[model samples]
Target chain A: GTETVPGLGQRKQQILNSGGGVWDLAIAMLETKNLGTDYVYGDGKTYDSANFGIFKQNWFMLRTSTSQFKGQTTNQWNNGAVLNSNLQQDIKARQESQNYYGPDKWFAGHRNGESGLSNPYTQDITNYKDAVNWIHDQLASDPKYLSDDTRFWV
Target chain B: GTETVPGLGQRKQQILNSGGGVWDLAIAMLETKNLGTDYVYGDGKTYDSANFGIFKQNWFMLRTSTSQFKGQTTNQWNNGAVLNSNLQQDIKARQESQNYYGPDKWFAGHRNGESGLSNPYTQDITNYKDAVNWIHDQLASDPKYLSDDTRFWV
Candidate 1:
């Protein structure tokens, strides 16, 4: 009788249950762009790249293939093949476009002067790459999501 | 018999009971100098300033007049009147010396170019000043440590 899905975290499940299904959640995530606030990931690195909130959270959701809130298995809405493919395509397009988020762009935005030397968050870009690569590896590790090669873009 | 001290934290008490007591701990702290790795303080600021480790931890100890490990009140080595006086003088000398820790000096040490255009940890100096002022205010707020005015130097 519980509305919760297996493996999906409570927050993700709640988001899915809120009016629309997985598609609505995906749209909402896309609309919710980066807030520029620092987000400290589990690796203890801080990143301010655009679209950080959605991509990071999605990566976690897929990697674990479970719900973060209760450590239970999530349903298709959380880790469904179709939902993941759509998410992957969206992320790939963003990465391939001029609006890509990474070290180069982060440095351009936060440089100290004309020479653009010594941005403190320089390592943040590298962290971003690591995060992206990690997500790709996670996806590749699972055969169900391996066909989508664009998800490997750093 | 309980080894618990009223105002000290558990970690501080453990250090004391380890046989070195406060004096030994003080010496150990002094010897435990910065290794250049960034320290993220409670305020979420990062500082690699020389002597930051010593000043920050010592301030916590003297401000509470207790051991950091245990919530028990500390004795002469931790908060003796004369010992506090000596410690205050040492910190004041460090702050007043040409080798002071501030934005200008930190930049000098870690600048990207001859013009000293970019220093990543620029805000760290401001945070350091804030930390010093906070400590000063904390001391002033307490009557026991207020008499020593030199503790306010950033």
Candidate 2:
């Protein structure tokens, strides 16, 4: 474990023998969501393509697990659910608090702790969508995300 | 027209001033589909905190326009309706192909047009989702796309 390779030379050598980056692409293909509307998981569950309703719930579960590791409390989690159930409740609360949204906007005091924190540190609840739309948005907004002449995995 | 500026610098400056960079963001917001999704569109549109459906359609229009313009087709005048419809069709087709899941892993041999010369360049319907995924994969995989601290945009 303490050996020093000094560079990525060894890794590069391994990649060369692995048939030019195709192996990496295969792995990425295996790991990522099926590029279809339906959510096909390795676990044998196939969710419907509409509302992506089932997929979104599954994503919520994944988020709950990840957020737990990051120290989100039970109150925060329940508040997130509450916020989801009634955006108006959060909006009114935020309006009274004048913290998150601010004075002019209707949703000023609302907090999105239930949906998880909106920051760069982790995936937010807002990310999952019609998976295809999410994919398109990623491509158009960040061309590098979709370009072929780039790497599949880091 | 031939040799004066050598670049669209001033035009780009105008675009920046008018918040063109936010164009994609606006599109993303529009694509959110759910009501109360936070979007930053200065374009004249009304939103009620309780209504997610209206927001979704509005966001779809904005996003479709963004993708089309970024690709920069010179033949047709930019039209949001055409762009949105085309993109939706492409997405639907890809979703269909992926769900077909016979012996074929994903949709294959799906073409948007039969004739070449008369057809305008557009994203292939079957490969659209993969193409978008490819973009994200590229960004994480390549240093150049990630260079300059840009959050996946120009």
Candidate 3:
């Protein structure tokens, strides 16, 4: 009972790759070795640009929220309740081409993943460091993730 | 309600430096500018070697447990319920001198922080990167935080 979040038990906590955690992303990166495409989540299908965009956006919200190096609790990830409405509206407002998914079908619609989605901008990930750097590019701009303390981490 | 862990809110979260989060530690480091001594936590007193050891060990347990880039939930940090018994015993059997606090008073006794603990070794942190590198040294040694996936994270 304690191994996960509530407590620490005799057994070490197991890392879940499918969920939202840096460790989860790490597994995803290594699994596909960066060259691979979008994630293949439940329902076992590849996410198209529309779905993948929502997927990445949701991931950005969760994975970055709690300093989740350990990964998220199963309930925390599967239930996309964490994805906010404001972000959904922002996603909806993307210029015609980017505006594929509507606000109604935000988190509720994205319960799983897929690998064959059509990626608009081809990700330039080559190795682990590169993967992290790419993620930096994605998250660096968001004031949500940026910290005033380490503002000049460079 | 959602801004902390379970959800996101409008106002940006002000990092709580006192709690157990990488961001918390970041604040501590930046507060001291890597030039000051131990943390000056609740009770507004300095922690001696005996207490500081317990503190650092406890910190190591919490901060690294989750990728905790964000920080621990208040209840998560205030309540030592997450610290297990095995760790308590490990802390106890440290050759005479290291064995300061008894196991009975493990997490229960360690409820807060202090900055005046008698440090055994002089911490050689001068800057932000150095501070992070020092943390890497701490968590990296523990197979607990170490991921089998990113086996070579240099």
Candidate 4:
């Protein structure tokens, strides 16, 4: 359905124009949850949310007020939201041992319910070195999340 | 003293453009009563006491208003009130029997005031015509008003 909406900025617009519905993207990525070791960056930032071709309607609702860290600005172009959401999902998946998404090692220290690791203030300890680092790690684990290789360019 | 004031739109701007002080234009136009007249057209239109620039200004007040005629859209740009005042001054100058400011029996009617001479609508008229006639008459009167032969143009 996100494909039919007009006036979305250029890059996201292209995906929608190419008949790639937002829900379609989301569903495809969700299926990758069964994979091993999905890693993503840890930087708090707003991502363009329209990239996920699945759950288009649900994602649209979350896209509006999403923001990154205090000093960061949301990237209105590209699949910034989709990338950010996927990173978060991958992090959770790693903690759950739902190997369908990725390996539990994708998370840094929080392996079990009794011995969860405190979030590190810096990247030296956090499983996600930084936001981009986590994003790259997740992409490395599963290429299906991207419409193409150039998706990393974002 | 007479050359110190702003005219209409962007009056202050005009003075600034001319490298003249705005005070002179404002005061001169204020003190001398060289203000314009305004009128309304359309069905059952009415004017207010504030319409007379002189009366509203205490002879030195800046004349401005929002009340306007709703019908007779053609009079959109008519110099309704301003032209009336100019005509009055010209008529007075003419009646003074002077050759410079006012000339001979050339009649100028006050759109607001009936000059008590043949009802001004007939033999003697000094005011700007109604909307329809304004375009027809003002342009036609330009030559007579402009010619060096007469001082009808104020």
Candidate 5:
């Protein structure tokens, strides 16, 4: 399971053997100090800020899981449907309640019958599109990344 | 050429015969609401609004031409590299100007001696993303669209 996460040297292997999702790209983006915060797992586990790479990989795993990521169907990280719905719902909820903290809050909010708990992953929904656009820009600028068949995340 | 644009009776035919690009998706989006604007050809002829289908096909043809839409190496519409560059540039320019129109303005702005002209297709970049998102949502809602190989724009 640890080997499945990118940047642990398994990403290249995974890509060469079986194509991986946008996890590598996401890891790269997060490492650039762009995403600004770590993600929380659907099981209400706060991603360790000390181990950012591992956190992203875990979050990627959770997001791609059908059992964990309730709203989405496909396991693809670049699954536009799931990403868009999560963002849209987050935005809608935030607008309705000024105190709302988007989907991350929802993920951490439910634990042992508790509701509306604080989100450990404090990133805002407003910055989500910017993060994606940044990833798109980075991918576009690098011809090597774009040309690689194994790197299908682009 | 009228048969090349999507949403017309010929879209299915074009899809069945040849693969398409983001152009068809854009045409479908524009056609949904009567844009009511006539676009001038490179030869200085205005397209008839009544024949919008033909206009879109012609536009698609022109756009695919390397000489017309510069910076794209491949003629394929679904070519992600070219599309990303165009969209990225459009966003950057719009951000710089704070009063930017979408990519169409850039397309028509470089006529022989012309500088900065009004765009016939006046959809903004934000709305463009929204339109794409809406299409993605629709496709996800209906599994049939997702399963169709011909419908690759989403």
Candidate 6:
């Protein structure tokens, strides 16, 4: 649980155990998807190995279940989801209609039955490749879904 | 880096970020693998939603490149490797032959040219599923590869 979450004590422990940190090297392994070519990002900035690692690590945390964030595992945090042309517009309309302003609005929406995302967890995944396409477009369409922190219900 | 790696600081930050760590909920989304059936875990334990979330977050950080770990991006990590048989045996023989002491030995062997994993970063990922299969079987074979910390080169 500690390792999966983020905190100061955890960093201290990680450095002491490795005599340094493996993150610098660990993320080098994560840049698999021909990273640069895979997605069109919301920020419009290119990522090098180090920066990409940082971006992806943040993404993993945001997407992991403990984070209360959910989405397709394939897409990147800032972008890269093969969203439909009107998906973003559709989402915007929904959010405005539903009155969600904070980062957790997506999570809240799903719980309150307003998120518009399908429940991929209960279905047979092989019906879909990689098993998680259910929520992919919904979360991947907007970088707001992947924001690095919980802004609280603003 | 801290959150991506299993440790105390990262865990602490994670808990604080959402008034609680998000791993619990984040992984609920990662279950897209239909996890119970995805890839058999090296250790045969049925993961509840919480445990699965924990497992996936660990996999993501090890994978993200900053950690210097590598492998295919689709597998659930411990056992979902879809190995071509002989792969595990092949890796074991190599490890025995190379005498890698700690977990990082895998890291060392890759660098020293004995680990035998491919670099997926530069290749056109559409050439493969999920993009990072380059090092997939190489690390995904044994659960040892995904251990939660830097065991160091023993």
Error at B20, model 4, angstroms = 20
For candidate 5, write residues A15-120 as lDDT tens digits.
Answer: 2133222322433343333222234322233322111222122223233222324254334333322322243332222121111111222233321112223332
Per-residue alpha-carbon lDDT of candidate 1 for residues A1-154, written as tens digits (9 for 90 to 100): 0122233344334442332222223223223222111344311322221122233333222222122212323332232222323443433322221111122332233222112223424565446434433443343244432222122222
List the candidates ranked by TM-score, beginning with the highest. 5, 3, 2, 1, 6, 4
Q: Could you tell me the TM-score of candidate 2?
A: 0.22
User: Which sections of candidate 4 miss by over 4 Å?
Assistant: A1-154, B1-67, B70-118, B121-154
**Per-residue C-alpha lDDT of model 5 across residues B93-131, encoded as one tens digit per residue:** 212111111123322332211222334233453354445
TM-score of chain B of each: 0.27, 0.21, 0.18, 0.18, 0.31, 0.17
Candidate with maximal DockQ: 5
lDDT of all the models against the reference?
0.29, 0.26, 0.26, 0.26, 0.29, 0.26
State the lDDT of candidate 3 residue by residue for A44-154, as single tens digits: 422122222222434323322233212544344443332222333322222111111211111222222122122212233123334433443332344332222111111
Instruction: Give the CAPRI class of candidate 2.
Output: incorrect
Per-residue C-alpha lDDT of model 4 across residues B30-114, encoded as one tens digit per residue: 3233323332331123232122322122100111111222122323323224423544332222112111111011122222221
Each candidate structure's TM-score, on Cα atoms with residue i matched to residue i, is 0.18, 0.22, 0.23, 0.14, 0.29, 0.17
Q: Give me the displacement of residue A151 in model 1, in angstroms.
A: 63
Clash number by candidate, in order: 31, 15, 16, 48, 0, 58
Candidate with the larger TM-score of 2 and 3: 3
| Residues A23-141 of candidate 2: C-alpha lDDT, one tens digit per residue | 22222222233211234331243221111111122222322322221234433333333322332332222212211111111111011222333332233222321222223323334
Which segments of candidate 2 are over 4 A away from where they belong? Answer: A1-76, A87-154, B1-123, B140-154
DockQ of 2: 0.03
Which digits, one per residue and each the tens of the lDDT, describe model 2 over residues B1-154? 0112222233323322432222212222223322122344313333211111211232222232233333333232223224233434323322222222110122122222113112323455334433433333333344342222222211
Model 3 alpha-carbon drift over 4 Å, by segment? A1-72, A81-154, B1-21, B30-130, B136-154
DockQ of each: 0.01, 0.03, 0.01, 0.00, 0.05, 0.01
Residue A108 shift from truth in candidate 6, angstroms? 28
CA displacement after TM-score superposition, residue B5 of candidate 3 (Å) = 29
Candidate 4: lDDT over CA atoms?
Answer: 0.26
